[PDB]
Structure formats: structure tokens, C-alpha cells
């Protein structure tokens, strides 16, 4: 019985491939992280055919499915037990996701309480 | 494709006030409500003025308010200001009034109350006259600032009674070559 969401719509995504920076392939000092080139003679700036794409706002996603995971839930970053009772009433749409530095012994309680509340957890088998 | 300029499509007039103070925003909420849910344009004007800057809501002198109520036909009729009501020393006699304003100084308050007047706030006004009937609208002088003398057609230019910016007046600080007919010329 996986936790169903209230609605499981079509998550269309207009583009999946990442926006790499011009010339990240050649050099190492050049990172993948995007940076808009503001040169005079550049090609990419001026949309030559068969060249690296530039990010417009047009790619923006439908409002209904922004930050939406495939299951249908949203994340919420948790550090401790007190923060679950918040979600207990917004139970079916959202899900807790536990923080990295939190230990194992407390994780145990976090999952035990959340399992009582029926709240779905993304990382319940995280250490052992 | 279409040949329209998109130069002046955005309008700059104010929508909401830059100030974070709570009381002004609560006025706003109220008069937004009455603005949309009534017909009266009065409320729209009052709204516009509530957003405007210090210069744009200037202080109204008492002398000006008094004689503006002395005008005939507007007897027993509430005066409405957005700026501050300051006192005037150069006015001895004070007929009894019914004022509304955001701030009034203590002196003007005493002058009115000993005469037997009345100072309303806006929440009291909304209850008294929601559409605002029996109301004389007023404003102070926007051009009253000293700065407007500095504006306009430049000095040293035929017909331009315009204050130049100067560190200090005196005999020998911008009196000579362009002003005397003797020395060079004048305009």
C-alpha cells in the first residue's frame, strides 16, 4: 500500500536536459554551472543555428505541478519530531523528508510516530 | 509581427504605499473596500491621496481653512484634509469648526476646542458619513516649497525669474559680467 496522493496528474516536463555552459567540454577550469556570456562577437548570445540554447522564461512549468515528485507529494525538510504534527493535517499531499545530520536512534522514533500518523516518509531505511 | 511601440504601456502611478506603518495600511484596507463597493468618486480621491509622499500631502494652514469655510453655502460642513493642520499665529479670531485630519498639533487643537469645535478621525468619519456628504475637500499648496523658484527657464536667459544656486549672496558673488549693462552685457 503505497501512500496515494490526492491527485496523480500528468507531469509533463518541457525540457529535461541541463543547460551546460559554452566550452565546459573543452576545459576543466570551466564548470557546468550556467553563466550568460556578455561578449560582442559571441555566437551563442545571438542564436546561431545548431548552437547551445539559452534559457528563456518560456520553459516555465505548469503551476499545478511545480516542485512535484512523481508520486505526487511535495517535500518538507525535517529535523525532529515536533515538526511532524504540523503535517498531520496536511497529510495526503505532503511528506516529511529527514535531514542528513539527524541520527539513527532518533530516526527510529521519527518513523514510528510518522507511521502512526500515516505520513509517508521518503527515507525510512537510511542507516541500519 | 505588429508595428506598435511598447514604450509607454507601463503606467507609473502608485498602487500601494511604500510605508510599512500599520495605521496607514489599515486606512487603506478600509477605503479599498468602500472604493470598490460604492459609486462615490470621493473615496477614490481620498485613496489616491493616501498613497502620496510628504511633499504631495502638504500642511494646511488654519487661516486658509477658515476662510474657505467662510465662503457662502458651505456652512456647518466638515472640512477634509489629508495633510497636517498647523496653527496660525497671525490670526486672532477663531470661529468654531468641524475638522478632520491625520495629525493636528496641540496648539491648533487647543485653539479649536476652547472655541467649541470638534476633531474627527477617519474611523469616526466612516461611521458618520460613509459616502461623505456635507464635506469640503481641501489641500495645501504643492508649489509652496522654496525649490520651485529654482526651476524653469534658466538664469542668464531673457526673462527667467529663477533663483540660482549660490553659496552666499553679497556684492561680489554673481553680480557682474552677465547682469550689469556696463560690464559686458545683460540680458
Amino acid at each position: 500500500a503505497a501512500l496515494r496522493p490526492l491527485v496523480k496528474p500528468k507531469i509533463v516536463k518541457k525540457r529535461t536536459k541541463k543547460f551546460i555552459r559554452h566550452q565546459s567540454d573543452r576545459y576543466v577550469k570551466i564548470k557546468r554551472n550556467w553563466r550568460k556570456p556578455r561578449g560582442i562577437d559571441n555566437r551563442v548570445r545571438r542564436r546561431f543555428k545548431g548552437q547551445i540554447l539559452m534559457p528563456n522564461i518560456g520553459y516555465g512549468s505548469n503551476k499545478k505541478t511545480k516542485h512535484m515528485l512523481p508520486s505526487g507529494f511535495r517535500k518538507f525538510l525535517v529535523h525532529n519530531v515536533k515538526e511532524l504534527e504540523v503535517l498531520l493535517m496536511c497529510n495526503k499531499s505532503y511528506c516529511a523528508e529527514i535531514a542528513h545530520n539527524v541520527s539513527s536512534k532518533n530516526r527510529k522514533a521519527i518513523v514510528e510516530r510518522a507511521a502512526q500518523l500515516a505520513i509517508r516518509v521518503t527515507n525510512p531505511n537510511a542507516r541500519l | 509581427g505588429v508595428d506598435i511601440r511598447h514604450n509607454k504601456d507601463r503606467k507609473v502611478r502608485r498602487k500601494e504605499p511604500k510605508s510599512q506603518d500599520i495605521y496607514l495600511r489599515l486606512l487603506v484596507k478600509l477605503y479599498r473596500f468602500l472604493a470598490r463597493r460604492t459609486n462615490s468618486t470621493f473615496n477614490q480621491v481620498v485613496l489616491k491621496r493616501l498613497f502620496m509622499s510628504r511633499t504631495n500631502r502638504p500642511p494646511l494652514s488654519l487661516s486658509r481653512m477658515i476662510r474657505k469655510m467662510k465662503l457662502p453655502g458651505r456652512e456647518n460642513k466638515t472640512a477634509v484634509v489629508v495633510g497636517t493642520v498647523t496653527d496660525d499665529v497671525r490670526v486672532q479670531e477663531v470661529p468654531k469648526l468641524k475638522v478632520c485630519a491625520l495629525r493636528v498639533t496641540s496648539r491648533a487643537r487647543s485653539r479649536i476646542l476652547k472655541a467649541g469645535g470638534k476633531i474627527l478621525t477617519f474611523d469616526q468619519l466612516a461611521l458618520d458619513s460613509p459616502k461623505g456628504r456635507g464635506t469640503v475637500l481641501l489641500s495645501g499648496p504643492r508649489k509652496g516649497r522654496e525649490v520651485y523658484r529654482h526651476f524653469g527657464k534658466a538664469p542668464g536667459t531673457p526673462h527667467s525669474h529663477t533663483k540660482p544656486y549660490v553659496r552666499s549672496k553679497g556684492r561680489k558673488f554673481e553680480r557682474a559680467r552677465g547682469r550689469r549693462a556696463s560690464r559686458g552685457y545683460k540680458n
Binding site: - | 510605508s19 510599512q20 506603518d21 500599520i22 495605521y23
Partner: protein, 53 residues
Amino acid sequence: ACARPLISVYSEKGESSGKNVTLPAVFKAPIRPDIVNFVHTNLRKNNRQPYAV
């Protein structure tokens, strides 16, 4: 506001004494954080020693 209530005094050991004292008027004064905030952020800067190369 115009209305001034009556406050009961408590003994140091917790019980309420007989005496009841009137509220001073400042407590009904206007709240204005923009000012509080502004003032705090200017007065606190004065308690500051110089640093320089």
C-alpha cells in the same frame, strides 16, 4: 484609549493582596515597529570600537 482598568497586586509569596492599582496611560499608547527597529539599529552602532589597518 480612554479606558483605564484596575490591576490587582500580588504578594511576593504569590497570593493576591487586597490592594488594586490603576493602569497608567502609556500602556495604551501606539505601537510602531518601524521606529523601534530604526532606533535600535542606530543606537546600537555607537557602542563600537574602531578597527583599521
